Structure 1
Amino acid sequence: GRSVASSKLWMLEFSAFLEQQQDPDTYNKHLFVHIGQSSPSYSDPYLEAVDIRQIYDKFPEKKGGLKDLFERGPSNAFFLVKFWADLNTNGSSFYGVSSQYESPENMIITCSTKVCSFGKQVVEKVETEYARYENGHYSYRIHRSPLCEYMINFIHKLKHLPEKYMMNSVLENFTILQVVTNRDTQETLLCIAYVFEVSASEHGAQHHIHRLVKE
């Protein structure tokens, strides 16, 4: 399906999942959210835009916050992803996040992922990634990064809510900000603001991508 790309970096894959080991040779994987999974990832200009001012309150403010990052640019690196998450799933559990990126440039990149409540940072995961040459480009992979305990707790609490509409009510004030940076130059390669609802679709998890624009 649709993914996100700036001039310097393309995110081809993103997934968060729960993997259960039934026995040493049998694994069951449930995807909560996914980009570039059920169909090959792509990027094209047929994107619609969202006024970034409409979402500033849902993300960290001040120096290094969303407004500061957007103002510093480049504007073509900024996206809003809405996920309709698939929460229908059941020691031997592993909660993971995987992602993959491509660039024409050989860089050392840093990926900062901030989980936010009412626009306030609760936890941050920071990962450093080196390039691998592949089919005429450089690839970067975060493979099966353990989901932090806050998110495991959050998902447990969500599933313990008696009604699905309650889950949506909680999700309205839960956001994730992903900022991928060239470590040396500090250039913003990708900045993705994530917003969530629960999926009601028979096909499971879904996503919509929007460009973020000034007005």
Structure 2
Amino acid sequence: DRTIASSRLRLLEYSAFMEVQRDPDTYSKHLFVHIGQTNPAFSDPPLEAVDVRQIYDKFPEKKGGLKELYEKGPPNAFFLVKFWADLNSTIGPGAFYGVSSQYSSADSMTISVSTKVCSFGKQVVEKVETEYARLENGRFVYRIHRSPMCEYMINFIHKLKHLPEKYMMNSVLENFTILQVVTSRDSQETLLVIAFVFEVSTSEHGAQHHVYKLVKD
């Protein structure tokens, strides 16, 4: 619906950030990538389709693979989001690097989230998070607050930040991807798959993003 959603699970918000404490009462937070809760509008164009086969080689093959996953379906659960990252932090040791996200659902479940960082289509790291339903407003929501980033990514961001030029940053990111797979913890049915491809915001405008639906013809 323009929404990143399946029939069983919707991603409401996604945020990868760093927080630093300026003084005992004051905190600063820079967001690298962001997806914000929007309400679908009736006038919103339908999402563009990207053939799932063109990105097979960006994420790992075979088991746990997008091909195998897409083969398992449901296909209306597979999304691709392109991220324009904000690497301009006006913000040292002790900063917190986290990811916060919310999902929603008509059904109450125990979700397990799998996130695979990928370099040149090879998995560098998997993080697995379990999150629990809470009843809000005609739906259940799942809230992941300040899930810490792992070192691989802290080092990646820093070193990427350290490159002199935004064009070089984008070249590295051309072969950096993240695959998120959300299952129902017990049954392992697929609820939501998002593939994450990245680019540096050359604008210096704040971070942006764009959603596509993955199809298979």
Relative to the length of structure 2, the TM-score reads 0.94
Distance 1:157 1:148 in 2: 15
Distance 2:39 2:61 in 1: 31
Report whether the alignment pairs 1:116 with 2:113: no
Q: Which runs of 5+ in 2 are unaligned?
A: none
Distance 2:11 2:75 in 1: 16
Partner residue, 2:38:
41
Q: Give the counterpart letter for 2:6 in structure 1.
A: S
Q: Give the counterpart letter for 1:204 in structure 2.
A: G
User: Matches of residues 123-142 of structure 1 in structure 2 within 5 Å?
Assistant: 123-142=125-144
Asked whether the 8 Å contact 1:3–1:35 carries over to 2, the reply is no
Asked whether the 8 Å contact 1:175–1:193 carries over to 2, the reply is yes
Deviation, 1:3, is 4.3
Distance 1:176 1:190 in 2: 14
Distance 1:77 1:13 in 2: 16
Distance 2:204 2:161 in 1: 18
Partner residue, 1:30:
30
SS in 2 for 1:128: strand
Which of 190, 212, 215 aligns to 1:213? It is 215
Distance 2:8 2:18 in 1: 31
User: Matches of residues 155-194 of structure 1 in structure 2 within 5 Å?
Assistant: 155-194=157-196
SS in 2 for 1:153: helix
SS in 2 for 1:57: helix
Per-residue CA distance 1:103-160 (angstroms, 9 max, x = gap): 0101011000000001100001100011111112111011000011000000011011
Deviation, 1:98, is 0.4
Q: Give the counterpart letter for 2:100 in structure 1.
A: S
Percent identity (aligned): 78
Q: CA RMSD in A?
A: 1.3
Partner residue, 1:76:
76
| Number of residue-to-residue matches in the alignment | 211
Distance 1:171 1:3 in 2: 25
Q: Give the counterpart letter for 1:195 in structure 2.
A: V
Per-residue CA distance 1:156-196 (angstroms, 9 max, x = gap): 11011111111001000000000000111111100000000
Deviation, 1:23, is 1.0
Distance 2:160 2:22 in 1: 24
Q: Which runs of 5+ in 1 are unaligned?
A: none
Q: Give the counterpart letter for 2:10 in structure 1.
A: W
Distance 1:174 1:192 in 2: 14
SS in 2 for 1:150: helix
Relative to the length of structure 1, the TM-score reads 0.95
Report whether the alignment pairs 1:93 with 2:95: yes
